[PDB]
Design a protein around this ligand. Structure first.
Ligand code: ARG
Length: 238
């Protein structure tokens, strides 16, 4: 009763999890996971690019069937949609210029310009904790714009997923003179517990198939094989 084609929405400004190569094709760990799960599910899968903040609306409107886009499993989102089991762990952390004294605190940030991705958990955290209290929190339609405004000095800092920032910006030439500003920001309520496949709540059979495939590809070591392409550490977490 699975669809012949599972349509999977993703935002492509999140290397090494999801982005586009020079041909415009989807690449990254999210794509590898999604493709491998679909293979084991014996379904065709079609990737659909969209802005991050359009993913959950598109899912609810049935324009896509699933979201694989470093989508954090939060209490708040679970009131709207369902999730597969955890795909990998994710933390949030600030980045700023190398040498910056910036810390993820109100005192340190009050007066600064801080970029966040529209529709993200980081946007939610920053709006409640920082924007109300004077911090210029600027929301962006995609993370590419954020990095651009940061390196152009239009932003002083940016709050986003730690691993994506590290592997996709900081460890790349463009992020050479940038670094994490302070430790990971810990807030269980806002940031949730790793990422998962976002699904409509009533698609019970689809969720069971993703979950089965995920457990199996983890059990036979395929997960770790695919992960080693991008990461030299345990990206799954606990
Ligand atoms: N493909 C992306 N740009 N993903 C951003 C994910 C940010 C965060 N994990 C969230 O779920 O809100």
């Amino acid at each position: 009763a699975l669809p012949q084609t599972v349509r999977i929405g993703t935002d492509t400004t999140a290397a090494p999890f999801s982005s586009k190569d020079a041909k415009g094709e989807f690449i990254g760990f999210d794509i590898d996971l999604g493709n491998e799960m679909c293979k084991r599910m014996q379904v065709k899968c079609t990737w659909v690019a969209s802005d991050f903040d359009a993913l959950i609306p598109s899912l609810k409107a049935k324009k896509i069937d699933a979201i694989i886009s470093s989508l954090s499993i939060t209490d708040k989102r679970q009131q709207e949609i369902a999730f597969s089991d955890k795909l990998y762990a994710a933390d949030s952390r600030l980045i700023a210029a190398k040498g910056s004294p910036i810390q993820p605190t109100l005192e340190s940030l009050k007066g600064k310009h801080v970029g966040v991705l529209q529709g993200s958990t980081q946007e939610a955290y920053a709006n409640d904790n920082w924007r109300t209290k004077g911090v210029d929190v600027v929301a962006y339609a995609n993370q590419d714009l954020i990095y651009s405004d940061l390196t152009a000095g239009r932003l002083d800092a940016a709050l986003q997923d730690e691993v994506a920032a590290s592997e996709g910006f900081l460890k790349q030439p463009a992020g050479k003179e940038y670094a994490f500003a302070g430790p990971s920001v810990k807030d269980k309520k806002y940031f949730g517990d790793g990422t998962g496949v976002g699904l409509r709540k009533d698609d019970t059979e689809l969720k069971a198939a993703f979950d089965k495939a995920l457990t199996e590809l983890r059990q036979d070591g395929t997960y770790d094989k695919m992960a080693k392409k991008y990461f030299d550490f345990n990206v799954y977490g606990d």
